[PDB]
């Protein structure tokens, strides 16, 4: 174990660039010293290059647009960023990449699929200039062209590679062909010229005329990568493999280990942000990321460790639920098999096997370690429902709409990861101004005379304030036996409104009189008294709805920035401000939910496919007139 050898990365591209090619042929290459049909299912898996572990961690969730997203981000430290060569970067792989720097993330670029027709590295590199803003530095030139594409430049070194066929088998290291020379010596001049601007001691020997050496000058590309100012462009071609090694020999030279990434923040119980340095002999904090029910030995519970050592046959402290586990083993998973080690230091990655109550997000300390928190507790809210009748917010219940369960969540595609319904907004109901009413059953029904009768007073109370009930009830006008039923009617009734069928919420209901018989009265009567009292109470309240309104961030390209802020507006949203992010413009606003549905396509048909954007519920509020009428 040593802290400086550890990559923990992330592969990310687009849907088509090559992320599962180039993860297998790594672990491919990775596992051929010493060391069924399957998608690799391991949220975090283990391998061994040049005396380095790279764990790398798989971000599968689905549409990657969610905000589960973050934890995988900030649970690696760097990422190769994956192009498809023919097309430069892609309007998602423009996403992919405003993600990147959005949680400051180092990362090397790879130009996937130089073998196809189309490739060319030279689109890759001004596309990055252009739409990124990302100054790229030519770290490889390719030999031949598309069907011809058969070697690799490096021209840091000036060496250069042939493939001798497609299958990984024959790698063989040759001198820069004559015609490739006067462009590899240009790029090279090139690449001293960046690594210069972060090593003074380079730019005096670049004005001299004097060769740096292979040491610094990747010492100086590194520190410009970590730093997020430069980013190296490899390329190879994964499917027919040519270019894989070398780019694993870039993720030790110029990715981060645990040390080159600011560390994590906590939460103390006494309440402050502290920082936790990766200190393997420090007390124990980490972090849950992931479960998976594997068939084997259960219930695994994947981890990353920030400080101290988790070791196995020990107890924990789930300091996110205040509870004890029992660590009964700790596991790593390889690319074909999966082993059972003693420990599991800092900056490190694995599973456990026991724990009971370890949920992900969940924060695990060392049994007397200081109880600090990792992650935000915030618990956020039910807004979208989908009727799926053919606890990370995918709530299940059942009440109106009789015989129909409803998967409740939050954001369009963000509830949906379980998801044979269509996505509704979940509206609520209530009142403007005071009322007063009575609920009467008073029936010959079912081999028996059935007698109930309530008065009530319904109030609109302050907006998020919930509901109140009080029994003003005096000297057995009600017969106490009886409030009960009246209690149970008032709330099923209120589960139904008036306008839509929705909820009632913010209202103060009070019993004030009544009465009943003495022999005819019953539960069943009140019950039907009190329902029909509450019903009768919202429809002549002046009644609104209260529909829920988003917030929201649009990051959009500048060209499009006037086309989005019309559309926006044209939603009944409010711009709220707007702040730059690299060479993009994030737009915050509010807008009702109930205008969100499908904007995703619709942001990008205004902006040529380059935007995108997060949600959030922020608060309750009334539909405007026009909105309620129309809402029937
Ligand atoms: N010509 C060529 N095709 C490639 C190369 N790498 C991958 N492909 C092909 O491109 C397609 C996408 O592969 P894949 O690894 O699934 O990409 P992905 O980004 O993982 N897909 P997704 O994210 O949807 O699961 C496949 O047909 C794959 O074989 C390459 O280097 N050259
Ligand atoms: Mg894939």
Redesign the pocket.
Known sequence: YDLKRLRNIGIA??????????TERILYYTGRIHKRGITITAAVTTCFWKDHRINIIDAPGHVDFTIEVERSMRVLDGAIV?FDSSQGVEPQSETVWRQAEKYKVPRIAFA?????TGADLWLVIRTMQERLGARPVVMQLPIGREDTFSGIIDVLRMKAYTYGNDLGTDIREIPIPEEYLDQAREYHEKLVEVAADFDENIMLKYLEGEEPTEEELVAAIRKGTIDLKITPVFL?????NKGVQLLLDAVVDYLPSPLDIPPIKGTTPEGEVVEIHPDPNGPLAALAFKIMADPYVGRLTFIRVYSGTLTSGSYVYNTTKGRKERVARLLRMHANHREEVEELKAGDLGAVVGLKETITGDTLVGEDAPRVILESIEVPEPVIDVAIEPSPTFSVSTHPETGSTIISGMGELSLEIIVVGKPQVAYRETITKPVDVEGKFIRQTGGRGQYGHVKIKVEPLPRGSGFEFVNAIVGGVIPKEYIPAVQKGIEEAMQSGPLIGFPVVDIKVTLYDGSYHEVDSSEMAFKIAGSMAIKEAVQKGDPVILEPIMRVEVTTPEEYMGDVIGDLNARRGQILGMEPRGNAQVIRAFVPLAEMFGYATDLRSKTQGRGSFVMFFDHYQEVPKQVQEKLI
């Open positions: 591209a687009h849907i088509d660039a090559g992320k599962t090619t180039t994956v996937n699929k130089m073998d196809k190879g071609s994964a499917l027919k």
